[PDB]
RNA sequence: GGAAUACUGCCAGCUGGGACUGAGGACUGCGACGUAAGUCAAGGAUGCUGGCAUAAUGGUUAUAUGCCGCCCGUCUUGAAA
RNA sequence: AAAUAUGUAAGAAGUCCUUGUUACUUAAUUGAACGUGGACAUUUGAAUGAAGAGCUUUUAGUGGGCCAUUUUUGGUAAGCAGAACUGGCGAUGCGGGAUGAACCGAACGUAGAGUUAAGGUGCCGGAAUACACGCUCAUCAGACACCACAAAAGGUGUUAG
RNA sequence: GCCCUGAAAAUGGAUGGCGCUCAAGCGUGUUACCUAUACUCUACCGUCAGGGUUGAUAUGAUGCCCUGACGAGUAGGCAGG
RNA sequence: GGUUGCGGCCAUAUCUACCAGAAAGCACCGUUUCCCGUCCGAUCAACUGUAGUUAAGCUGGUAAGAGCCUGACCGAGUAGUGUAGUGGGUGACCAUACGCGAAACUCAGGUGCUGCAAUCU
């Protein structure tokens, strides 16, 4: 019959990259984590304890716990019409930094500045994005680039 | 043909009246709907809301928490607002002055308000001498202290109270209640 | 008679009724979990910083 | 595809900081309105040089007009085309007023004669056939004899009315 | 207002036929607003759309 | 916030029609259906 | 070289014919035209004329005519079966 | 190594400055948490929409499903059996497909006037025996999605290349 | 490309039928026209929502009045009769 | 700039072959009383820095060098794909419309960068 292990269809999602294999860097060793942070998890399968369930492979919480070799995760996951709210905990070699976290906390400094300049000039700011507009009126010009004109091409076999 | 977004004809989930037909009440109700509707005064729209309540949104508030909140830095004179009843309380020795307004007082509750010098007032009173609900404090009862609602939200590891009718050990206190019985909850 | 198996067919219609909302996010939320040594030291540090605060109070 | 008009139209790809400047392209397209051709731009485009409209931007759109739309010319059109079973070029001759008059009486006979619709013919080339005798194709070399005529036997004339109180003829 | 559009319509021909007159091309601005009008009834429509 | 408070326009059935055969189709296609440009004013006007 | 015309678009440009509707019920509003008093097509029709009395007209009913209309109830993915 | 699908973020529960608490932690008032006091509200930190948002209790029916496009497994195949996403039928009339659960259009209070959809306009039947360029003659022509089947292979028929 | 051969089944029969051959057939283009319980504008019924109003002043305050939107339905729930 | 110790990223750093390297460093290198480990002072331990050498290590150069890296309207807007039609085709399948878009290929360029501390003609 049907076989549903806890690392069914795991096969190339736990698997190292090519030409990765082995030891682990000690970077990831050296990352440090805060309650609060947000991490990507991401098994590596090379490190067997600690381990994320493959369902959250993939998935980005919040780290509401710090223990001597692992962190806790709060992942929110849908079961049924609602969401669970889940608690994993993670070795560190499974996990990383959040670097949207990090766009977003450089830009909320840049806002504080970009805020400060213009009070200090007592100016208008606007700091929220735009999305990227239609596009102005351009003069093309023909100096040098007299247009090429081109016309279909005729079948032909090249086999 | 539209594509409704939402459920069609709606009705709020809300008593629009008191699902009761005393007389009395409706009057208090029709007095009300004066003063919400004519004056600004955030106070009767409260008050005319509560009047509307069935009776286990009317905990009883007691006598005791009135004089508790009486208690309150810079309340000590205002006049404490139940819509719904008041209860005694053999708890409190000393009781204060006031003057409280409110549907209805326990035969206790009148006595030990009048004893210490105070006022027992009914809503339309209250009208008169409050049209806008000056310097009066709102007060509302625990629903959440009722019976039933010790068993809503029954389930494995909810810490609920069993639809039980009758108890001691012997009654639902085995199996899938205790480690050593299958399981614990 | 053998009859149909299995099908998620509808499953998400009616899931999304009423469905789907979100957390329910607190400022304060459960400490289920948390290293229990680090509460306990929690709980010492929470009294105190009260402690003092009523201190300045006289 | 309907009633033609012929357009120019020029693009070119998105300027770079790398490349501010870069070259322009232009096609002549058939088509009936102007959205129709500056799709046909894109299509021919996409198939010539890496860009889609995405990336590119179209900077003229000018309808040419026939020079000389009552002198008669004869035309060579030249056509690739999808037939159910694969992919062809033809040369075919036209005779008309102007080339948004032959081009238009190239799709009908693409239509009708090998169930060519619009999507499956490229124009590849049209162009007014200089010296008489440089025409290659019978069926309109017919018409270039000196002092043409012809009758146009057995005539029918519409009737306006559903009876008639006479045997009608054909007579011209 | 009627200003304001005569005068913007008007500044948009001229600009064109001075890049006509200089070997130019004046190539407009690109739209800012479209009007949308739905012509599809009500049954049968995927979910996203 | 405008074009917000402007309701929904509630346009008829274009009177004289819509032009093509089929609207199911792109503009491109042969009729109805995605951005027909300028064009728009016509359809609009005889929908309003 | 100087025009015209087509095509496309704009006008808070002027006008003819036909059709359905006429909800509301003192006055309050926004305006327009007047030098003015006043007038008005400006928060939903008025005015003038005529026709009908054992009648004009309306309800019902029978029948004809045009088009349309399978037997209900049930179980069922599916019943006129 | 795509496309489609998929997680998180886009701030007042935020930012910055000052310096309080602890039994945790550090060589260390060092960190870590949680705070006092002080400063910053026009765009306060993209878009679009919001027909109000949040929450509680309780209870009906159901728990045979089926169909279409697309992905897809078993099978020679099936109007066969079995999955994926969505939309339908079932529970639903209406207009078109002659007919028809499921296709196309479009979803429904009682009506008047106008306009259309999909589909049509010789006659049955409301609507051009309309306009335009070709192609086709069948002693078994052909005639419209789903759809009510046709192939290999041949023709000195006729067309254009 | 069209057409022809390849092309055999049982009651008599189906491009829906008649019939149609420079089509009423096949490919393509352009206009006009017909028509749904859909769209637009208006009346009326109901449902939901928002708002006004017993301040002294005849007859319904669960009433009167103003305004906007909405209406498919088996099993089934509730309501008013 | 060299060199060493501890590193970060982990081939632009690896591989093959041939050259070249001042100074200091590093190394090889001399020894076996001692602590220590071997079948074997080879490795491992200790001792001298004394007798020797750049041979090797190591560093750098060379190469139409193998690999690795990067770029490119090189291939290719191709393959594949989201969405659309009462589109074509007996079908297999294909074209068009609004979008997204590869891989191999080819050619061009490149062959470690860097943090801390020490030391050096
Ligand atoms: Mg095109
Ligand atoms: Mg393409
Ligand atoms: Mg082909
Ligand atoms: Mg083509
Ligand atoms: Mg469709
Ligand atoms: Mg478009
Ligand atoms: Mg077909
Ligand atoms: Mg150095
Ligand atoms: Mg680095
Ligand atoms: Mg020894
Ligand atoms: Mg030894
Ligand atoms: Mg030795
Ligand atoms: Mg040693
Ligand atoms: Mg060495
Ligand atoms: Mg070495
Ligand atoms: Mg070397
Ligand atoms: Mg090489
Ligand atoms: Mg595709
Ligand atoms: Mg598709
Ligand atoms: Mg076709
Ligand atoms: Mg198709
Ligand atoms: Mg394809
Ligand atoms: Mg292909
Ligand atoms: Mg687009
Ligand atoms: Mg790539
Ligand atoms: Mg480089
Ligand atoms: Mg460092
Ligand atoms: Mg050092």
New interface residues.
Partial sequence: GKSHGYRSRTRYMFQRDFRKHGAVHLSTYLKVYKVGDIVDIKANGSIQKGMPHKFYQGKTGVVYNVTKSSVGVIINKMVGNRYLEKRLNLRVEHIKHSKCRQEFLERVKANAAKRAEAKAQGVAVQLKRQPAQPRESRIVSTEGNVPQTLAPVPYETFI | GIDHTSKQHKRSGHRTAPKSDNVYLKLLVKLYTFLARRTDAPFNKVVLKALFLSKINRPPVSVSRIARALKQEGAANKTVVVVGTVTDDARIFEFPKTTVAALRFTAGARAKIVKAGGECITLDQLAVRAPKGQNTLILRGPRNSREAVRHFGMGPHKGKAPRILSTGRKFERARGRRRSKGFKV | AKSKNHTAHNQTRKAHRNGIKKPKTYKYPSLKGVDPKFRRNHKHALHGTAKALAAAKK | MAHFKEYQVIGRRLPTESVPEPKLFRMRIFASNEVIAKSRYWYFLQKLHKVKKASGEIVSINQINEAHPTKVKNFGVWVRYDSRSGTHNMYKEIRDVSRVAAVETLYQDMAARHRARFRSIHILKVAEIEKTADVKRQYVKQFLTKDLKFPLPHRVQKSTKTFSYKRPSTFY | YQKEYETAERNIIQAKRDAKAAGSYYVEAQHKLVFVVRIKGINKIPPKP | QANNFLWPFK?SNPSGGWGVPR??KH??Q?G??G???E??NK??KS?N
Wanted: zero cysteines; aromatic letters at 24%; hydrophobic letters at 60%.
């Fill in positions: 346009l609207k199911f503009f491109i042969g109805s259906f951005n027909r440009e064009f728009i359809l609009v929908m």
